[PDB]
């Protein structure tokens, strides 16, 4: 039987299918033919995937599916990092029961399962990439010798677990030990629909769930939701709906007046979905809501062209089969409005995964820490069906300073490789960057890595300045006429950001001196190419 | 400018809307101006629906026509003070539920209302109902809470009050670094000697025992590896593994509840923040004016009962001269306002003797409060009186126009940074030739600013420091300024922080790449 909808696990049908078809087909056939052929039994499995997706449930379910003892448990950083001379004793103790049973009745016993949580720490000499590795080869050598060294056993089965699959030494994966490896992944719409159908099953049985609640629609509003957070959403909804019936006094007592009629309504689901349970591979209206701070105003031609090009790039990266990766670089003079446009372009992609790697959250970090943080941010984007990332103010990550010059050579070389890297098969990406010194990056050869570039200009005519002032709607018609009497017969040079500060400074004077001070200010800072 | 709280009849508003905009085209998202009772309002189109067929004979549309029999429903915008009455009010919003009515005065906490309600609704809403209905639903009670805020704002008191409200055993206590004790075999023994009572009670009484609160402290020392991601430092993390194994996993318990309290929310590993582990997260901040009033009104109740408080000592007034006063410093002020009052009625002659003739009339008076407010409690997140006291040395005397110009410009900037909403951050750089008086003309502007929080970061207190120490000190000083509704900060001799020396140059590139970043960082929100 493979009734994988009653055991408790949902959204994983092919994974268990393959795992059984290959590994555990010998332990289900009658022992007669199994002995006649002489086929040996697998004694190792490696599951790897993102954290909080349902890896332990599968382990316990596979253990129970074949009648066996209660699975043991271990932890990675626990067995290691204890008093010397005792870790080996613990490792030897781990298999004591299996060894005793084998010595007692030989080749006729029950499976003894183990679950080696977080295996990519102790059995890892590949710790030297940017910092340093640890001298702990004793543990890995002892484990390898025990599982299969110069001796063998037939009453064991080792299941590993890890969220970093590229930190495992090949010595622990040669055929004969830890052969079958599988990858668990984030569920899609059908997976979420199945998952939401199990965690709320007892409530529906006892007519304690209102008929308005819709699961089909609830399966379309949670995008890139991990498996373990639907449980959190359901629990939050249950808590919210049941808090109305706790009206009490100095000493809290249950409101027995209407203990019945305790019904959960769609409103509570929606409330818990908007205010609480913030996703892991889903982003919020916090990161891309502090960069944009005064909206976007159309003061001329450039805004429309830039937004149109952004939309074209997005629609290319969403409907192409031969260019899974696209990049674009924004540039312009300082105080021109580069950062405030990248966020606006990215916000309208309706992309499930959005993140912003800015330099203001890394203050005082060393080189290696910054490289590792950037690498982690990039790695957290290959796991979603389609994503989008932003890298703003590049020239303050490299630490460029005109004197010297002085850059950091360990960040540029990571940035180039990561910019030219392609994601796994089937997925897509889009990278946007903003910089204010185009003449410097060209020397470093970086510009040849970016697919395309766009130019963001400043205000360069009296008409555009007047239009911006009108749209901002601050000065009256008379003052606008007075200003136009001067600005029109000349040229201007001022970025959009500086205009807000100049207007704010000017507005604080007396009512009759709000124009002269502004005009005086525009002569010193502005109109100065 | 014309906002008012007077009620507005939606039925009349809808009738006037139809009477005016009849046979007119409207589209979703359209913005227009509507006049009602000589009052102007801004209208934004939200939903449009077609009519039903006539009697002789609710689709959504984007554009349509308005007629006499059309219906209009008015809803106030977000954070709108407009008062709307009548049946022409559609109610599609989100408000959760009506939390149980609370009486904070009896418990003894003031200024914390939303946080208390949220914590009770989330963590504890499922530990009050009988086990029957909870079992029928199927649930796994929350077993984790995290709190973080400035010291002395009433964090532990919340936990103790909530624990004593729900009949439960006396809470234990542990200290963060105290559990980091030399060698293994004692720290692990300490971890073991925390849940033995809980597990024994669970085994003895099954799934019917009482709650066992366990209050931590400085949880950012243990379970802290981000501290290694710095310019220096570095330490292996081993104790977090034991606590993680006990809290969740095999032999899990059903009558435990951890409560972690910290001070640096960003020095926490992601290991101890994922659903199933410490779930909820709340923050406690400095109290505001009404908070200070409520706090004071609670600590001076016993004296008022027995008629020990004079009639002229108003409590309302004292809530307007204490700005950015922490929670505990109000208790400190109240305590210090009594020693002075009661230190008068004591005579000593070869031995301290309690006075007898004037023992009665022992009443605390305004003088005690005023003296204590000026020379007793020294605030922490508040205005100093020594920093900008030794900088300006011999006053300021006019010698021409430039002094007037500089002072006027400073005043204009300091008023803009207080009556603006589109530019929360403004910075100005003074400069001139050496030996000209550009450090006694900034302290004067800061002192005339009148902002509650005024600090001065100067190189005089960083003699012999390396680069990392300077970075840490500057970061801490700047961070402290995000905890007040207004802040002014001064940097002196920027050339000295960078260590410039023209046999070179030999500047420091780890301080110049932080000073640039800091000067562009909008405060969290509305500060
Ligand atoms: N059409 C517009 N284009 C760009 N910015 C605009 C526009 N209209 C208004 N703004 C405002 O301009 C500001 C641009 O952002 P910001 O001041 O951070 O510029 P920046 O180029 O990112 O700065 P810096 O060069 O210092 O990194 C934002 O406050 C945005 O509200
Ligand atoms: N504009 C001014 N008018 C009158 N007196 C002034 C003025 N500016 C400063 N003073 C006085 O002169 C002295 C100024 O000394 P201060 O330490 O400020 O020197 P400085 O040249 O600004 O310093 P530094 O060389 O470190 O930049 C103080 O006594 C101050 O009272
Ligand atoms: N695919 C899934 N279906 C149903 N429940 C799940 C699933 N994945 C996780 N859960 C729930 O999450 C809880 C913890 O998940 P766990 O297996 O510890 O995640 P991880 O494998 O990352 O450690 C389990 O008790 C289980 O009920
Ligand atoms: N909101 C508050 N209401 C009443 N008293 C408070 C409040 N906050 C702090 N206090 C007072 O401060 C004293 C100590 O507070 P404490 O719990 O040590 O603060 P922290 O949580 O920062 O350690 C208590 O005796 C308490 O009376
Ligand atoms: Mg000086």
PDB file of C-alpha atoms and ligand atoms in Angstrom, chain B residues 391-399 403 433-441 493, ligand 2:
ATOM      1  CA  UNK B 391      32.303  73.456  25.149  1.00  0.00           C
ATOM      2  CA  UNK B 392      30.927  76.994  24.982  1.00  0.00           C
ATOM      3  CA  UNK B 393      33.377  78.714  27.323  1.00  0.00           C
ATOM      4  CA  UNK B 394      33.097  82.531  27.234  1.00  0.00           C
ATOM      5  CA  UNK B 395      29.729  83.124  25.605  1.00  0.00           C
ATOM      6  CA  UNK B 396      29.196  84.577  22.146  1.00  0.00           C
ATOM      7  CA  UNK B 397      29.740  88.257  21.304  1.00  0.00           C
ATOM      8  CA  UNK B 398      28.829  89.981  18.047  1.00  0.00           C
ATOM      9  CA  UNK B 399      31.559  91.343  15.789  1.00  0.00           C
ATOM     10  CA  UNK B 403      27.598  85.711  13.460  1.00  0.00           C
ATOM     11  CA  UNK B 433      39.859  78.398   8.491  1.00  0.00           C
ATOM     12  CA  UNK B 434      41.461  76.992  11.650  1.00  0.00           C
ATOM     13  CA  UNK B 435      41.158  78.914  14.917  1.00  0.00           C
ATOM     14  CA  UNK B 436      37.882  80.629  14.037  1.00  0.00           C
ATOM     15  CA  UNK B 437      35.287  79.396  16.541  1.00  0.00           C
ATOM     16  CA  UNK B 438      33.337  76.714  14.674  1.00  0.00           C
ATOM     17  CA  UNK B 439      32.866  74.435  17.705  1.00  0.00           C
ATOM     18  CA  UNK B 440      31.332  77.042  20.036  1.00  0.00           C
ATOM     19  CA  UNK B 441      28.820  78.082  17.354  1.00  0.00           C
ATOM     20  CA  UNK B 493      36.772  67.442  14.149  1.00  0.00           C
TER      21      UNK B 493
HETATM   22  N1  LIG C   2      31.563  84.008  16.802  1.00  0.00           N
HETATM   23  C1  LIG C   2      32.104  84.161  18.014  1.00  0.00           C
HETATM   24  N2  LIG C   2      31.980  85.356  18.629  1.00  0.00           N
HETATM   25  C2  LIG C   2      32.521  85.516  19.839  1.00  0.00           C
HETATM   26  N3  LIG C   2      33.200  84.634  20.577  1.00  0.00           N
HETATM   27  C3  LIG C   2      33.305  83.461  19.946  1.00  0.00           C
HETATM   28  C4  LIG C   2      32.803  83.146  18.695  1.00  0.00           C
HETATM   29  N4  LIG C   2      33.105  81.835  18.358  1.00  0.00           N
HETATM   30  C5  LIG C   2      33.775  81.399  19.396  1.00  0.00           C
HETATM   31  N5  LIG C   2      33.930  82.324  20.394  1.00  0.00           N
HETATM   32  C6  LIG C   2      34.630  82.128  21.656  1.00  0.00           C
HETATM   33  O1  LIG C   2      35.958  81.796  21.308  1.00  0.00           O
HETATM   34  C7  LIG C   2      36.349  80.520  21.850  1.00  0.00           C
HETATM   35  C8  LIG C   2      36.210  79.528  20.727  1.00  0.00           C
HETATM   36  O2  LIG C   2      37.105  78.415  20.930  1.00  0.00           O
HETATM   37  P1  LIG C   2      36.913  77.061  20.143  1.00  0.00           P
HETATM   38  O3  LIG C   2      37.303  75.896  20.963  1.00  0.00           O
HETATM   39  O4  LIG C   2      35.481  77.031  19.617  1.00  0.00           O
HETATM   40  O5  LIG C   2      37.848  77.227  18.877  1.00  0.00           O
HETATM   41  P2  LIG C   2      37.838  76.749  17.360  1.00  0.00           P
HETATM   42  O6  LIG C   2      38.715  77.573  16.509  1.00  0.00           O
HETATM   43  O7  LIG C   2      36.378  76.673  16.927  1.00  0.00           O
HETATM   44  O8  LIG C   2      38.369  75.258  17.475  1.00  0.00           O
HETATM   45  P3  LIG C   2      39.065  74.142  16.571  1.00  0.00           P
HETATM   46  O9  LIG C   2      40.372  74.786  16.104  1.00  0.00           O
HETATM   47  O10 LIG C   2      39.257  72.882  17.342  1.00  0.00           O
HETATM   48  O11 LIG C   2      38.133  73.986  15.370  1.00  0.00           O
HETATM   49  C9  LIG C   2      35.331  80.255  22.950  1.00  0.00           C
HETATM   50  O12 LIG C   2      35.747  81.018  24.075  1.00  0.00           O
HETATM   51  C10 LIG C   2      34.067  80.922  22.407  1.00  0.00           C
HETATM   52  O13 LIG C   2      33.434  81.511  23.534  1.00  0.00           O
END
